[PDB]
Amino acid sequence: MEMEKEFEQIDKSGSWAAIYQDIRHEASDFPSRVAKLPKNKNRNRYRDVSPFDHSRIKLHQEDNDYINASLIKMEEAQRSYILTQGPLPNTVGHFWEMVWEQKSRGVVMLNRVMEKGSLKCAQYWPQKEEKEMIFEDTNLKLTLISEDIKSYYTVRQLELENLTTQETREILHFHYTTWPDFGVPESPASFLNFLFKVRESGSLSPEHGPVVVHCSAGIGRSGTFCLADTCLLLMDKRKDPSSVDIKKVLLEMRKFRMGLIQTADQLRFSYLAVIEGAKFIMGD
Numbered sequence: 001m002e003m004e005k006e007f008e009q010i011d012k013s014g015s016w017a018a019i020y021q022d023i024r025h026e027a028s029d030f031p032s033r034v035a036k037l038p039k040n041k042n043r044n045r046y047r048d049v050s051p052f053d054h055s056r057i058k059l060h061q062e063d064n065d066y067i068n069a070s071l072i073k074m075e076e077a078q079r080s081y082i083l084t085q086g087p088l089p090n091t092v093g094h095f096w097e098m099v100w101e102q103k104s105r106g107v108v109m110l111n112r113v114m115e116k117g118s119l120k121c122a123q124y125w126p127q128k129e130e131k132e133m134i135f136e137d138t139n140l141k142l143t144l145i146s147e148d149i150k151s152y153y154t155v156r157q158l159e160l161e162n163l164t165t166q167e168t169r170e171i172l173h174f175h176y177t178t179w180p181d182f183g184v185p186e187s188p189a190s191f192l193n194f195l196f197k198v199r200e201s202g203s204l205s206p207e208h209g210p211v212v213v214h215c216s217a218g219i220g221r222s223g224t225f226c227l228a229d230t231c232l233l234l235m236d237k238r239k240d241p242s243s244v245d246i247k248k249v250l251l252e253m254r255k256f257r258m259g260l261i262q263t264a265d266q267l268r269f270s271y272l273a274v275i276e277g278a279k280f281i282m283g284d
């Protein structure tokens with residue numbers, strides 16, 4: 001059913017809460033036993049948000065391989081994403097280890113460091129060219145190369161060095177800086193502009209490791225970003241664009257990480273973003 005009509009039918013009937021609870025009821029439940037080991041308590045931001053054992057990203061070290069991060073692998077769309085929490089004071093070194101080991105080109109950040117007067121994630125990248133960061137626990141160096149500040153987002157060029165081998169790589173940091181403290185944006189225009197900038201960079205392409213995407217918990221805004229991207233890509237591959245079912249794509253993604261899309265308002269915004277985004281996809 002053309003999602004634009006499904007959209008007006010749910011709006012006129014005011015049933016967003018009912019659709020959202022149906023998704024919550026049908027979502028997969030897989031074990032997260034590694035996340036809950038006592039040795040990992042200070043590696044989790046939130047007690048109720050954990051990666052499943054089957055899809056978790058493993059760090060390449062014998063000591064403790066755990067990070068709160070999941071591989072979302074979308075078989076038909078041919079896209080992969082790593083969704084992760086905002087880094088904590090004791091996991092900033094683990095975060096950059098994962099970027100290095102997974103061969104990621106891009107990091108997508110959908111939150112501010114401070115929101116609602118509380119810290120939502122560590123200051124995990126350098127703010128000045130001449131003040132680089134060293135992560136002694138994982139043997140990495142990170143340098144700010146350049147910064148481009150726009151009205152809705154900032155793009156940064158970073159240099160990551162493996163101090164063990166002296167190899168270097170360029171990482172692009174895409175920072176969406178205008179998501180409101182409460183609710184969702186009124187129009188999806190600036191979020192879609194941002195998505196198109198990440199795509200144009202090469203960061204989502206199969207010649208690189210998966211993009212790393214985060215917010216505070218790595219399920220709500222992070223969920224909206226990957227759901228919109230996958231739905232738009234499927235509309236371009238299929239003979240019948242109207243066959244793309246956003247609720248079925250979301251349940252497929254929830255096989256790989258719990259809780260993706262945190263509110264009925266986030267579900268409505270995801271529909272809005274895909275409907276507006278299609279106009280350009282359909283060469284219009």
Ligand SMILES: CSc1ncccc1C(N)=O
Binds near residue numbers: 235240
């Ligand atoms: C208007 S149709 C179209 N336009 C661009 C890319 C893909 C399609 C399609 N058939 O899905």
